[PDB]
Write a protein that binds this ligand. Structure first.
Ligand SMILES: CC(=O)CCCCn1c(=O)c2c(ncn2C)n(C)c1=O
Ligand SMILES: [Mg+2]
Ligand SMILES: [Zn+2]
Length: 334
């Protein structure tokens, strides 16, 4: 291919150039990006980010190969799924891109660790069917049997993300050294596996413990002396970016909330048809969208982002406020 300016073919190039000025900002509107990029946000944003960080040249990644992988990856997100489609992936990627550039983490991560995090973010939900792990377990699916009921979807996301590199002209890591490929794989595994919600408690516990014994340079920049600490920060970062929806401008968060409930209810419908015990928040006949988000933010999202903010202080101060404003907004919408 000839490679379009912003990676994708668009009829609204300038309206798109407008939004991409927010590429490095929390305030980026990915819904607009999707609209202006013919529904290919993940391909667009990943291309932009990779140019922005000079990652194509750094790792000697042919552009045509990069674009072919990204389109392939995007195609394996399900368009009929309400929330867990390529838009969610583009969102999580871009948030991750911002969280990497946060001042308190300046010159901490290697280029490889950066590359891994962005690759993990992009693939973390590929080929999601629109139902939870427990649904795949209860139905005795092939997937749940392969992976022994443990992080089924997440394991599936890793398998699919990596196997796609083998489709014609998709090997974006072809010029990486063996050592680097080995190392990237590990990091990506750890990060994607950390997006299983049942890992959240331990993840946050470790992050909290990290925060209490943190050491800083003269500048305010965090000092992560060794590898083990860094991947712990990377795991939490992608996890944060994954649950970053309620930290965004209210206009966006509400649209995310609508997408997730549609997905949730659609599972519930299917659970009902099959006479299965309905999963939490999936019963359209008894679910309070507004209560659920307040519980979610109170028990999961605030504790998570608070701890992250302590770690990167004071870089996340505005993000934390926005979460608290959004919490309040949903509290009063009951
Ligand atoms: C709007 C948004 O952030 C959806 C992505 C998170 C999905 N999600 C949950 O995972 C969840 C939840 N409550 C408990 N849990 C474990 N809610 C409300 C939720 O949306
Ligand atoms: Mg996931
Ligand atoms: Zn996700």
């Amino acid at each position: 291919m000839n490679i379009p300016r912003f990676g994708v073919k668009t009829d609204q190039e300038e309206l798109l150039a407008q939004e991409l000025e927010n590429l490095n900002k929390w305030g980026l509107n990915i819904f607009c990006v999707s609209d202006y990029a013919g529904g290919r946000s993940l391909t667009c944003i990943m291309y932009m980010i990779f140019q922005e960080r000079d990652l194509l040249k750094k790792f000697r990644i042919p552009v045509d190969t990069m674009v072919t992988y990204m389109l392939t990856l995007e195609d394996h997100y399900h368009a009929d799924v309400a929330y867990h489609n390529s838009l969610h992936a583009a969102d999580v990627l871009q948030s991750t891109h911002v969280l990497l550039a946060t001042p308190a983490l300046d010159a901490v991560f290697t280029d490889l660790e950066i590359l891994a995090a962005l690759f993990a973010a992009a693939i973390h939900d590929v080929d999601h069917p629109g139902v939870s792990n427990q649904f795949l377990i209860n139905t005795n699916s092939e997937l749940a049997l392969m992976y022994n009921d443990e992080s089924v979807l997440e394991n599936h996301h890793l398998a699919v993300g990596f196997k796609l590199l083998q489709e014609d002209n998709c090997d974006i890591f072809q010029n990486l050294s063996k050592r680097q490929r080995q190392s990237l794989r590990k990091m990506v595994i750890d990060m994607v596996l950390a997006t299983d919600m049942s890992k959240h408690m331990t993840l946050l516990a470790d992050l909290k413990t990290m925060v209490e014994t943190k050491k800083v340079t003269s500048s305010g920049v965090l000092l992560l002396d060794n590898y083990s600490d860094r991947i712990q920060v990377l795991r939490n970062m992608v996890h944060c970016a994954d649950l970053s929806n309620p930290t965004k401008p209210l206009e966006l968060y509400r649209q995310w909330t609508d997408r997730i409930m549609a997905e949730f209810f659609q599972q519930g419908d299917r659970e009902r048809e099959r006479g299965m015990e309905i999963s939490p928040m999936c019963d359209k006949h008894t679910a309070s969208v507004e209560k659920s988000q307040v519980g979610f933010i109170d028990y999961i999202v605030h504790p998570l982002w608070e701890t992250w903010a302590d770690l990167v202080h004071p870089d996340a101060q505005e993000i934390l406020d926005t979460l608290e404003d959004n919490r309040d907004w949903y509290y009063s919408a009951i």
